[PDB]
Design a protein around this ligand. Structure first.
Ligand SMILES: CC(=O)N[C@H]1[C@H](O[C@H]2[C@H](O)[C@@H](NC(C)=O)C(=O)O[C@@H]2CO)O[C@H](CO)[C@@H](O)[C@@H]1O
Ligand SMILES: CC(=O)N[C@H]1[C@H](O[C@H]2[C@H](O)[C@@H](NC(C)=O)C(=O)O[C@@H]2CO)O[C@H](CO)[C@@H](O)[C@@H]1O
Lengths: 496, 497
C-alpha cells in the first residue's frame, strides 16, 4: 500500500490577509508553487493552523480575512484535480496557540472537558471541514497534560464517529474523511499521554510524530535535531517514559526504558511500537524542512556537541542577526531557524559554511569555523535513510514541517516521493550504519519465542522460560511455585 | 506497655498421639519443661499447628488422637494460673500444611473465596478456640498470592468481628481474644501481598515477622539466616518488592527498594514500617531457636560467604549425617538443622567447632575448620541487639520459632524476658555496630520537607522543589510547565508540615 506523504503547509494570518502569488516578499511560498507534478508527490496537505476559540469551537484566527482564507483553501483543494488520492486536511493547534503557555491553551483544556463541550467541539470540527471544503481533521495540541487525556480521547472518538457518518452521507467511501493528530516525537512530552497511546491512536488514521526539534538553543549542548540513530559521542537524556503511569514493575520499566538514552527519530518510533494496540501502519515519521542554528560554538567536532551562546527564549530576545547569509532570518527576526530553501542559498554563496555529515545519526550539519556557528538540518540524503527506515519498520509514511520551506524546485518533497515510489530508485544496498538503536522491549514489540508449556505443580529455577496464555515468560528469581500472571516472579519476555 | 514475647510451640501429630513427659526420645520437649517461672516469661504461646480441612474449616490433622490433643492443650492452658497476662493461642498453617505445594494449600485458597466460605471458616476458628480452650487465633499461611489477598483480608476481618463478639459474650474484656498472623520476613515472599499490608494488619493485634531462614543450603553462598544488619562482605539480593503491584514510578520503586540489598532482620522490619498504615506497635520480630548447617565450606573467613556442597532439597536425600556431634540430626534424619539445645551440646562435647562472632550482623556462627562446616544460629548475645532494636524501633515485641528448641534450662526464653523486663539488665550503652542499615524511602514514609508553594504558569528547571497539595515535589527533568501530582515530571519527595 502506498506510503503517506503528509506535508503540513503553514500560511500565517498576515499572509492569508495579504495573499498574493506574485510577490515572494509578501507570501514567500504561495499555493501556485505547488505544481501538478508536486501535487502528485503528496498524499496529504495539512493546512496550518486553525485554532479553538473561546466559544470552545474550531475556528480560524479572529484576525483572518474569511474571504482570502476561503480563496487560499480553494486553491489548495483545486490541486485535487491533479491527484485523486490527495486530501487537503486542516490542522488545529500548533505550538503557538496550544502550548501550555500559549495564547489559546485554556480553550483546548475546556473544549474537551465535558460530553457537552466535546460534542459541541467535535461538531464544529466537521462543520468547519465541510464549510471550507477540507478532507479531514488533524489535531495538533502540544500537549494535553495527563489529566486532560481521557477527555482528549473522548473528543477524538466523537470526531471519528461524526466523520464516519459524514463519509457515508457524502458518498466518500473512495476517499474517506480522516482524523489524525500530530504527536510528540520525544519522550519528555510523550510521557504526558504515553500510558494511553492505544486509546489515543484507535480513532485515528495516523499519528504524525514530530520527530524533530529534538535539539535546540534551549539545550546546553549543540546536537542534531532529528538524528535517525544515536551517536555515543552526543548527549544522552533521562528516559521520561519510565515515570509514566503505566503500572509496570521495575523490571518491566527498566527493560522498556533504558536511561539515559539517545533522543533520536528511531527512539520515538520504537517507543510507540512498544505499546500494545499501536499498529506500525498508523505511525508516520515527521521530518523537518528547516534547520536550527547555534552561535558561539567551539571546534573539534564540526560544531557538534559543543557549549554555545545562543538565546533559547521566544521571541528571539535580541536584534543581533548573526546567521551569516540568512536574509530570511532578517525578514523573520530570528537567526536560530532557517528553511531548507534558505540553507541551500547560504551554501551556494561563499559565507564560509562547510557541509558535514554524521554517519551514525545519518544527518547533515553545517559548520562555520570563522564565526563558530552550527546548524542541524535534514536534506535529500538524510531522507534516504529515513525513507528506508519507514519501509523496514512498516510505518504508515512520512510527514513534514513544512511545505513552504522546501526549495523552489521542491527537491525535498520530490526526494521523499522518489524513495517510496520511483521505479528506478533502489535502496536495497543502502547501509543503515552503526548508530545506536533504541533497544527497549514492551508489551507491543515482544520477540516471537518458543518455550515448554507452563506445568502447574512444577517448581522453576531462576531464568526458566515457559509459554503460558500465548506468551513466553521468564522467572526473575528461584524456586518459583506459582503460574505466570499470578506470581510476580515471572517476566513476559516473548510472544506466541 | 510490656513487650510481647510470643513463643510458637510445635508438637507434631506423632508426639501428640504418643505424648509423654518422661521420655525425651519420644517427646523431646514436653510441656512439663515450662515451669511457673518460665510461664511468666511469655505473653503468648502459639500452639502449632492446626489446619484447614477439605470442608474448608479449621481442624486438627485427622490422624490426631483427640483426647491426647486436649490433654496437651490443657497442660498449656494450665500455665495461665501462673501468669494472668498469658495467652495460649493456636496457629493455623505452617510451612508443611500451607506452602503452595503443601498438602492442604487448596483448602486455604478456597476457604477465603466468598462471604459464605469466609463466614463458615471464621466460625469454625472460634468454635475450635472455645472447644479446646485457646485464647486467640494465629494464621500462618505461607503465603497468600496476589489474587487471594483480598479474600485473605476479608477472612481476617470476619474472624476479628467474631472474636470481639465472643470477648463480650464471655465477659473477657480483661484478656480479649486475639488474632495474629505470621508474615514473611524476606522480600521474595513478602512481595506477594506487600501492596496490601495495611489492610492485612488492620484486623490484627500483631503481625509476627518470620525474620529467620534468610539463608539456607538452598542458597549458593553460606550466610547468616537472621543477620540483624548487613555485612558488605556477605551476599546481596535483588529487591523483589520492586516487582510488587504498587503502581509506583520507576524512581519511587528505586528509592523505596534499594537493590541489590542485604537480606536482614532490619530490612524486613523497615520494609514493613515504610508502608503507610502499618503501626510499629503491631510488628513482632521473630528470632530462631535453631541453626542451619552447611558442609563443603572453604576457610579464610570462618566459613562465612563461601560456596558449599549442601543438599538443598527437602526431605534430606541421603543418610550421610555429617554434622559432627548432632545426634538430634541422626534421629530427625537431617544434618542441615539443629535446635539451639543441640548446638549448645555440640559446643560442649568438644567436637572441634569454634564459636565465632560477626560484629556487623551481630550474630554468632559455628565453624568447623577440620570438616569444613558452617552453622548459622542465634543465641543469648545476638538477642541483646535484637531486643535493643525492638525497643529502639518501638516494635510490639519478639516472637520465636520455636519453644521446644530452647535448652532444658530455657536460657533463650529467659534471655528475651530479661532484656525487656529485668531491672538489673541495662543495655543503654550497648553498641549496635556499623552494619548496613536498610534505608529505603517510600511514598509511605516521606520525611517532612519544606519548599516554596507551586506557582502555576512557572517553568521549573530540573531538580526544583515545590510544595503542593500536602507534599513536597521535585522535577525529574527541565522546562517543567505542568503542575505537580498529575504528570510524570514530578517526584513526591516529602510531606508538608
Ligand atoms: C521552525 C518553525 O517553522 N516554527 C514554527 C512552528 O512550527 C512548529 C509546529 O507548530 C509544530 N507542529 C507541527 C505539526 O510541526 C511542531 O511540532 O514543530 C514545528 C517546528 O518547530 O509553528 C509556529 C506556530 O505554531 C510558528 O510560528 C513557528 O514559526
Ligand atoms: C527448622 C524447623 O523447625 N522447621 C519446621 C518448620 O518450621 C517453620 C514454620 O513452619 C514456619 N512458621 C513459623 C511461625 O515459623 C516458618 O516461618 O519457619 C519455621 C522454621 O523453618 O515447620 C514445619 C511444619 O510446618 C516442620 O515440619 C519443620 O520441621
Amino acid at each position: 500500500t502506498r506510503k503517506a506523504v503528509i506535508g503540513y503547509y503553514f500560511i500565517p494570518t498576515n499572509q492569508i490577509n495579504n495573499y498574493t502569488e506574485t510577490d515572494t516578499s509578501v507570501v514567500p511560498f504561495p499555493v501556485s508553487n505547488i505544481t501538478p507534478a508536486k501535487a502528485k508527490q503528496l498524499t496529504h496537505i495539512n493546512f496550518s493552523f486553525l485554532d479553538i476559540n473561546s466559544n470552545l469551537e474550531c475556528a480560524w484566527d479572529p484576525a483572518t480575512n474569511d474571504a482570502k482564507a476561503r480563496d487560499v483553501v480553494n486553491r489548495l483543494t483545486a490541486l485535487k484535480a491533479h491527484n485523486p488520492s490527495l486530501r487537503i486536511m486542516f490542522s488545529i493547534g500548533g505550538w503557538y496557540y496550544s502550548n501550555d503557555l500559549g495564547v489559546s491553551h485554556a480553550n483546548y483544556v475546556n473544549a474537551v472537558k465535558t460530553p457537552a463541550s466535546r460534542a459541541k467541539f467535535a461538531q464544529s470540527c466537521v462543520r468547519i471541514m465541510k464549510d471550507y471544503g477540507f478532507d479531514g481533521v488533524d489535531i495538533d495540541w502540544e500537549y494535553p497534560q495527563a489529566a486532560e487525556v481521557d477527555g482528549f480521547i473522548a473528543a477524538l472518538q466523537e470526531i471519528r464517529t461524526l466523520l464516519n457518518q459524514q463519509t457515508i452521507t457524502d458518498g466518500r467511501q473512495a476517499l474517506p474523511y480522516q482524523l489524525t493528530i500530530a504527536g510528540a516525537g520525544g519522550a519528555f512530552f510523550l510521557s504526558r499521554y504515553y500510558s494511553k497511546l492505544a486509546q489515543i491512536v484507535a480513532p485515528l488514521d495516523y499519528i504524525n510524530l514530530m520527530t524533530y526539534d529534538l535539539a535546540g538553543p534551549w539545550e546546553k549542548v549543540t546536537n542534531h535535531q532529528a538524528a535517525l540513530f544515536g551517536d555515543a559521542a552526543g548527549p544522552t537524556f533521562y528516559n521520561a517514559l519510565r515515570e509514566a503511569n503505566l503500572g509496570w514493575s521495575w523490571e518491566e520499566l527498566t527493560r522498556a526504558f533504558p536511561s539515559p538514552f539517545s533522543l533520536t527519530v528511531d527512539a520515538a518510533v520504537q517507543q510507540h511500537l512498544m505499546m500494545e494496540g499501536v499498529p506500525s501502519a498508523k505511525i508516520v515519521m515527521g521530518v523537518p524542512f528547516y534547520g536550527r542554528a547555534f552561535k558561539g560554538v567551539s571546534g573539534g567536532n564540526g560544531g557538534q556537541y559543543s557549549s554555545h551562546s545562543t538565546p533559547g527564549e521566544d521571541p528571539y530576545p535580541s536584534t543581533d542577526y548573526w546567521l551569516v547569509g540568512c536574509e530570511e532570518c532578517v525578514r523573520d527576526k530570528d537567526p536560530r531557524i532557517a528553511s531548507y530553501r534558505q540553507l541551500e542559498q547560504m551554501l551556494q554563496g561563499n559565507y564560509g559554511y562547510q557541509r558535514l555529515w554524521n554517519d551514525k545519526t545519518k544527518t547533515p550539519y553545517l559548520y562555520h569555523a570563522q564565526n563558530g556557528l552550527f546548524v542541524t538540518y535534514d536534506d535529500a540524503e538524510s531522507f534516504k535513510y529515513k525513507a528506508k527506515y519507514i519501509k523496514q519498520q512498516q510505518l504508515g509514511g512520512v510527514m513534514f514541517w513544512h511545505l513552504g520551506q522546501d526549495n523552489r524546485n521542491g527537491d525535498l518533497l520530490a526526494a521523499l516521493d522518489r524513495y517510496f515510489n520511483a521505479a528506478d530508485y533502489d535502496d536495497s544496498q543502502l547501509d543503515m550504519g552503526t548508530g545506536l538503536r533504541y533497544t527497549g522491549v514492551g508489551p507491543g514489540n515482544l520477540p516471537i519465542m518458543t518455550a515448554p508449556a507452563y506445568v502447574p505443580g512444577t517448581t522453576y529455577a531462576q531464568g526458566a522460560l515457559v509459554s503460558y496464555q500465548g506468551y513466553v515468560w521468564q522467572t526473575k528469581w528461584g524456586y518459583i511455585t506459582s503460574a505466570p500472571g499470578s506470581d510476580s516472579a515471572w517476566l513476559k519476555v516473548g510472544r506466541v
